[PDB]
């Protein structure tokens, strides 16, 4: 399985994987950025709240494709609580343009973090690593199983039956609610594609490995 | 308030042709959706924007353009079928994949 | 049966009371919201879940509190219930693109 990290170097764990509200809502977000008032301010401004955007759709992005992984809330909420501590920083230097540029760096470096740590538990559980290739399989087979295929979105569970009507034998399919919910996420991706959107290939690791040889 | 709709209460003689007006704000990548809510029930997909055709195939004689000039999302059908008198609600996808509503315009057909 | 089932569909709780809304999904979703809408407006939520054991706080969470103990069920509670509460709730399912909402529930403080 291709990692966003090849050489993963070890990974802590502290026991973070059961916090909850840990995502800062937009009005929380909104009050660190009235903080930055001041003309010269204004163009890094805009720069920081690019980043924080990128930082939260990496964070989902994690979940979204790894939520079969363990360590997965773990990894995620250790970027939480890490970007908890950069905005204490940020209210106290809202209108310090060079320390925003740093705070700027370190939201990547707490990404690159989390992309690494992710690259180990992933490399210290093969049995998931096969399990996410066969689910990338089944996806693909579903490339093709569904050519001329009939789905309806706006009703119910469209997904999961016609997961269970190609695949609902496999024992995987069957004793794994994460293995059922990318194959699920993949008949969403399938058709998306299908309906003239490649966007999709570069959406996620998982419409990335699917839409690639 | 990402999305924003100008029309709150809109009365359109059956038959004739209607178009709720819809921008947002997101300005980058918007998800773009429409969804329309009839009495005592939960609003339903009514279509939907990913990237690729601005305007929207939706359903029921339904249609969207989006035109990330006016930056705007409107919703338009070509005859208003008294079978659509109901309230309409557009929308963007948020980061955790939630749907930020706008102000919602009722649609009376006569 | 429902893709996304809601319940009840009527409560009416006297200021104070403890009040619970349960909301199932057979879509093998992982994302679940809860949003409230009051008469003539919009869906605003409060607290969404992107899995079972998670919980994040919404546009309006204050005085509600949610719970995903598994990955068909999220419920919304309400601690100590206002007037202010009164309103109809929607649950919403997710895993593809779009949300698929469920039938609401009618809830009105009293006193």
């Known amino acids: 399985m291709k990692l966003r990290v090849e050489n993963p170097k070890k990974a802590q764990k502290h026991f973070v994987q059961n916090l909850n509200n840990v995502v800062f809502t937009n009005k929380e977000l909104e009050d660190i950025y009235n903080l930055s008032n001041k003309e010269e301010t204004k163009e890094v401004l805009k720069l920081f709240k690019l980043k924080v955007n990128q930082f939260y759709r990496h964070a989902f992005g994690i979940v979204n494709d790894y939520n079969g992984l363990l360590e997965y809330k773990e990894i995620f909420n250790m970027m939480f609580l890490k970007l908890s501590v950069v905005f204490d920083t940020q209210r106290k230097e809202a209108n310090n343009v060079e320390q925003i540029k740093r705070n700027i760096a370190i939201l990547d470096e707490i990404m690159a973090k989390a992309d690494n740590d992710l690259s180990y538990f992933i490399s210290q559980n093969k049995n998931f690593q096969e399990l996410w290739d066969k689910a990338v399989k089944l996806t693909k087979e579903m490339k093709i199983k569904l050519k001329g295929q009939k789905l309806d979105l706006r009703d119910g569970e469209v997904a999961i039956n016609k997961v269970r009507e190609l695949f609902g034998s496999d024992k995987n399919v069957k004793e794994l609610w994460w293995f059922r919910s990318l194959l699920v996420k993949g008949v969403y991706l399938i058709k998306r594609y299908y309906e003239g959107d490649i966007e999709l290939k570069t959406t996620s690791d998982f419409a990335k490995a699917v839409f690639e040889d | 308030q990402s999305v924003t709709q100008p029309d709150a209460r809109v009365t359109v003689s059956e038959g004739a042709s209607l178009q709720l007006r819809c921008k947002y704000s997101?300005?980058?990548?918007?998800?773009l959706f429409w969804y329309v809510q009839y009495p005592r029930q939960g609003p339903q997909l009514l279509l939907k924007?990913?990237?690729?055709?601005?305007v929207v195939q939706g359903v029921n004689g339904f249609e969207a353009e989006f035109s990330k000039s006016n930056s705007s999302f409107h919703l338009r059908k070509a005859s208003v079928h008294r079978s659509d008198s109901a309230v309409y609600f557009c929308?963007?996808?948020?980061?955790?994949?939630?749907?930020?509503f706008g102000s919602g315009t009722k649609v009376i057909v006569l | 049966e429902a893709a996304v089932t809601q319940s009840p569909r009527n409560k009416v709780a006297v200021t104070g009371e403890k009040v619970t809304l349960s909301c199932n999904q057979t879509?093998?979703?992982?994302?679940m919201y809860w949003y409230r809408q009051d008469t003539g407006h919009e869906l605003r939520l409060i607290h969404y879940?992107?899995?079972?054991?998670?919980?994040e706080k919404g546009d309006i969470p204050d005085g509600y509190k949610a719970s995903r103990p598994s990955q068909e069920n999220f419920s919304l509670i309400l601690e100590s219930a206002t007037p202010s509460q009164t309103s109809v709730y929607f649950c919403?399912?997710?895993?593809?693109?779009?949300?698929?909402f469920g039938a609401g529930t009618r809830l009105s403080v009293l006193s």
């Open positions: 997101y300005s980058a990548t918007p998800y």
């Open positions: 924007y990913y990237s690729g055709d601005p």
């Open positions: 879509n093998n979703h992982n994302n």
């Open positions: 919403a399912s997710g895993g593809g693109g779009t949300l698929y």
């Open positions: 929308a963007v996808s948020g980061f955790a994949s939630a749907l930020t």
């Open positions: 879940s992107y899995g079972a054991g998670s919980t």
